[PDB]
Design a protein around this ligand. Structure first.
Ligand SMILES: COc1cc2cc(c1OC)OCCCOCCCCCOC(=O)[C@@H]1CCCCN1C(=O)[C@H]2C1CCCCC1
Length: 128
C-alpha cells in the first residue's frame, strides 16, 4: 500500500518536523540542481485521498501539469516537496491536511481533514 509504505519509510521534510509531508524517492533524478522559488516546473503526477476514494492524474488531461514553485498556485506540500526534487526524479508524498486542504477541505473533491497521496515525476524546470 503506497500510502502506508510512505508512513513507515518516508523522510519528514517539514521545517517544524511534524510529519506533515513525508517523502520516499522511488526513481532518482539528474544533476544536483533542484528548483528555486519562482521557478516554472513541469510534472506528471498521480494523486488520491489516502482513503483511495477519489483519484486524479495529469494523464487524464493528456498533458503536463505546470505551476510556479512557491507562489501558492498549489498546496503548501507541493511547494515544499517538489523543491526537494531533481530533474527526472519520481517521488511519493504523503500529506497531512495542514499541508493540503485543512479542516475546511475542498468539496466536493476533498473532504475536511483529508490526507493526500501523490506520485510525482519532475520533468523540467526553467528559471522565472
Ligand atoms: C481542489 O481541486 C483539485 C485538486 C486536485 C485536482 C483537481 C482539482 O480541481 C480543481 O483537478 C485537476 C485539474 C487541475 O486543476 C488545477 C489544479 C489546482 C488545484 C490545487 O491542486 C493542488 O494543490 C494539488 C497539486 C497539483 C495537482 C492537483 N492537486 C490536488 O490536490 C488534486 C487532488 C484531486 C483529488 C485526489 C487528490 C489530488
Amino acid at each position: 500500500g503506497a500510502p502506508a509504505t510512505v508512513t513507515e519509510q518516508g523522510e519528514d521534510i517539514t521545517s517544524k518536523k511534524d510529519r506533515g509531508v513525508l517523502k520516499i524517492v522511488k526513481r532518482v533524478g539528474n544533476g544536483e540542481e533542484t528548483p528555486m522559488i519562482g521557478d516554472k516546473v513541469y510534472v506528471h503526477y498521480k494523486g488520491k485521498l489516502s482513503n483511495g476514494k477519489k483519484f486524479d492524474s495529469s494523464h487524464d488531461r493528456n498533458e503536463p501539469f505546470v505551476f510556479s514553485l512557491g507562489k501558492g498556485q498549489v498546496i503548501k506540500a507541493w511547494d515544499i516537496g517538489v523543491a526537494t526534487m531533481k530533474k527526472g526524479e519520481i517521488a511519493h508524498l504523503l500529506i497531512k491536511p495542514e499541508y493540503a486542504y485543512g479542516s475546511a477541505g475542498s468539496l466536493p473533491k476533498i473532504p475536511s481533514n483529508a490526507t493526500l497521496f501523490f506520485e510525482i515525476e519532475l520533468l523540467d524546470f526553467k528559471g522565472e
